[model samples]
Target: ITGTSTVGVGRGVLGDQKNINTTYSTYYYLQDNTRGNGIFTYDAKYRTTLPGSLWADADNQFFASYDAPAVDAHYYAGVTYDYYKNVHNRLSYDGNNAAIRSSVHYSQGYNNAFWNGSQMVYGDGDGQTFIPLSGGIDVVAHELTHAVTDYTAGLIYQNESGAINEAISDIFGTLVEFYANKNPDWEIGEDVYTPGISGDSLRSMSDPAKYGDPDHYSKRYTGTQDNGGVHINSGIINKAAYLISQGGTHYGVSVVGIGRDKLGKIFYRALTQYLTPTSNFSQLRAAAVQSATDLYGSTSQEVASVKQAFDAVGVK
Candidate 1:
């Protein structure tokens, strides 16, 4: 809906109060024309619909119990848009300032969120397992990164390529979390997963094995489940990325950390310039090394650290 861009105060699922960009017409809507074309968020109303009704509040203030998810959805989408534009000098996910849209409360007790090839769809969670997912900035960034992958590498969503796709999301998602500096850590989905449980998240980049995920290439899952273990096997790459950003000793091998900034620069360059639709882990290793060389230098510590990180993860 076209209307005047406005601002609103909203509280997220975690009871975190923040200001959000919204649009106003008949009623206050979650439409902000601040970035690119615009950033729009909608209420799915506990249905399986794609992008349900445009969220409309009677006033420009949102603090009701049901307004939490939409608030986070709208605010976080703006944060992600700012990340690409401010950090990578890229406009939106497609680098063309494409409009970003998201929907919250997608289905009854739905436990997952996805990019859906076009727009973002988030579930309200079963309460026992997850609350409103938008409360987690990492989750929002993860889903939005899928759009980035599609626009850039277009990594096929299966096998090694798919795992790379998943790892890329985790890598940047973690970066986005750290970028926000809101209780930043390498843990994914920590803020909004299992409200009752503490210090447990859906996945951990610093240590994937905490959730029975493999952190080494030799332990990569070859099973056919989960789109060829895309989520499971991604642990290896995730650990490699973690190692690159923060050095670690794995399996008697040591990696000297290059820190997060260089890690992001290398991976971003690799994703944008070198990776392909069918690239595998080995190819990814080469791409990261080449990316480091391109950004830092062939003989730079950044390149050596990239190699050491991959090697520590047994990626060869």
Candidate 2:
């Protein structure tokens, strides 16, 4: 909805106070007009419907516990948007400044969140497994990166392609975390996972096997569950990405760390330029090598490191 662009003060799911871009038309709505098209957040009201009512605040001040999730969702969407625009030089998820939308409090005692091909949806969690998921910046970026993948690679959400798709989201999600400098790490979902438990996360990119995910292609899951273990097999690519950025040895194969910025550039170039809908793991290796070669030259250490990263992961 069009209105006077404004700012509002609110506390996020973790009780951190912050300012959010809002639209003022009598009530302050969680509609940020600063980014591309806009970033709109909504309230699911403990139901399954998507993109629920546009969140409205009477005085442009959100302090209620119910407002926490919406606050983070709106703020983090803006952060992710800045990541794409400032770092990748991409306007938005679609490179066209498409409006970003999200809904929080998706259902009662829900413990997960997702991108439903149109907008982001967050669950309030069962109070044990997770808190409001939007509280995790990486979680928000992970969902939004799915939108970026949809618009770029369009990698089918199945088998190798799907695993790559999931890894891409994780990769960019972690990058966005570091970009925000919010206690950055190579872990995913640490902020909102297991309120009672400490020092744990949904998945680990630096050491995938720490959470029972395969860090090498040899251990890839072949089962049909989870869209052919998209989440499980993604560890292979995630590990490779970690090696590409941070550098490490796996099974005697060593990869020279290229640092995060170079890793991001190589992968972003591949995702937007080389990856195809049905591209498999081997194809992804080739794309990464080619992307590095394109950006740094065939004889560049970047290209060599890209190859070593994939080789260390046994993707050859």
Candidate 3:
């Protein structure tokens, strides 16, 4: 029952180390520790006499070793919850009491992390190149925002729709990062990966050009990397959101000052409440402008600034 032996728990083998195979007994260990570590003690281990019957497995060998998956999940989930609640006035993942579940250490030395429709799955990483995927809040939020996009726009993972999907996630992911740290600089992924990699920060919201890739959107930006370049081409919208949040010069035009908080709120509202799956750059620009106007007024500086930022990004 203990050690590395493949003991089967059944209705007969109670409190025995060999030949243990029981559904009810296995359920006890599974319920005690979801991670499958045999730390908690159970009363008795029973055995089953039925052959070919469905028996639950309590093998803790496949579980993740990280101790803070639930903690990281809670942090990002809280940030997302508060962002929607305070900024957009929504509650939790859904309007109802839908709870978010997360699983870490999904695979052996797996480098990538993802939200598997229902719960978030994280990889332990190779330890040399990557650590734990759930180590950063932005990364967690990024995956969760994918779920949000699925619920809202249902953006197709192809051309413009795919880019929009990725960009929206990057946008809100950065916002959640900023909101959590309350940092005015708004740099993303500084805490996710090691500093050794030259251009390791997945996407840059402040200055995409800092990565020495491309300055703006182009026809050659399309590819099959990062979910059809979802993380790469996302630089366009990330830059757009950054510029809209913080007024500055773009496309040889001077942008009026509108402040980052206002811009982030408008974009958040537009993406989560207004935009649809088929929405494109033009439609997104219009929605953000409308969101600004609704939040402020028609003649508000924020509205004008939002429109200017969109145009500066070639979203006309």
Report lDDT per candidate.
0.91, 0.95, 0.58
Could you list the CA RMSD of all candidates, in the order they appear? 0.8, 0.6, 11.0
RMSD of 1: 0.8
**Model 1 score (lDDT):** 0.91
Superposition TM-score, candidate 1 onto the true structure: 0.99
- Number of backbone collisions per candidate, in order? 0, 0, 14
lDDT, candidate 1, at 22: 85
Name the candidate that leads on lDDT.
2
Ranking by TM-score: 2, 1, 3
Q: At residue 174, give the lDDT of candidate 3.
A: 74
Off by over 4 Å in 1: none
TM-score of each: 0.99, 0.99, 0.73
